[PDB]
Symmetry: none
Subunit: 152 residues, 2 copies
């Protein structure tokens, strides 16, 4: 039923400071030309409280064939977030949409923690976001596909 198959997702900087942008290399194959653009979104998932949309971009026109692209998005504003959405188990999710309907989601768990062990053992009362790093679990993508309408 799906007109588009996602063939690759590369997490380019799986271990980095949390202030660094998320960078993905994404490959997909269109089985048919589509009249409209594909919409790719990135979501930050907290405290595994609501999901934060990091960015959304449109790609088109969509011809039959394979396309691979780089997608860099900025991190959310950790200063205005619950500390549990900053330190601990989080997730990052790629969402693909057509005509405002999601047809696949790919998410990766990630652990966020202070890089230096003493601050891990004794976290300060005021967080120091410049010394926190995320570790994305690239070997375990969580995928769900959805039946949507396309052009017919």
């Amino acid at each position: 039923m799906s007109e588009v198959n996602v063939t690759k997702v590369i997490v380019n900087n799986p271990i980095c400071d949390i202030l660094d942008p998320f960078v993905f290399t994404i490959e997909f194959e269109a089985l048919n030309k589509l009249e409209a653009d594909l919409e790719w979104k990135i979501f930050y998932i907290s405290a595994v409280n609501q999901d934060i949309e990091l960015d959304n971009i449109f790609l088109g026109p969509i011809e039959r064939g394979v396309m691979m692209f780089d997608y860099a998005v900025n991190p959310p504003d950790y200063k205005n977030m619950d500390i549990d959405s900053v330190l601990g188990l989080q997730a990052i999710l790629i969402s693909a949409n057509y005509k405002e309907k999601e047809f696949i989601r790919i998410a990766y768990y990630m652990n966020s923690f202070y890089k230096d062990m003493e601050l891990r053992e004794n976290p300060p009362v005021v967080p120091q976001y410049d010394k926190i790093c995320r570790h994305i679990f690239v070997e375990n993508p969580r995928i769900v596909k959805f039946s949507i309408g396309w052009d017919s």
Copy 2:
């Protein structure tokens, strides 16, 4: 009663193609000068026999702190069981003195196809250039052993 303490181990390229060398940064402190060299080995652990990837000698050992980078080449995946290539494996750092092991540090790792179609349908002939390993860095498995030294 150990004369040498291992204070840091950093896995420099924890997520990479399996054909890339393993690179470690290792820090240790000798509480006393030692008459002989330290021997550091790296082992590839299958089906989580073991393959010794390399061994190097460091010396002379003076009292104090030393940090060094240790790069070793991967094993010959073409002559290995596919189950020793894809899946849960391990990589182990071994430190020895006078041919006696006094500490071992190991990390689990998952190795998987980067392309989703080959992940769902792995080929009968492996494509090692398209497999990636993820070394599980925040869970080091350490065991220390009391050995004889110089006294």
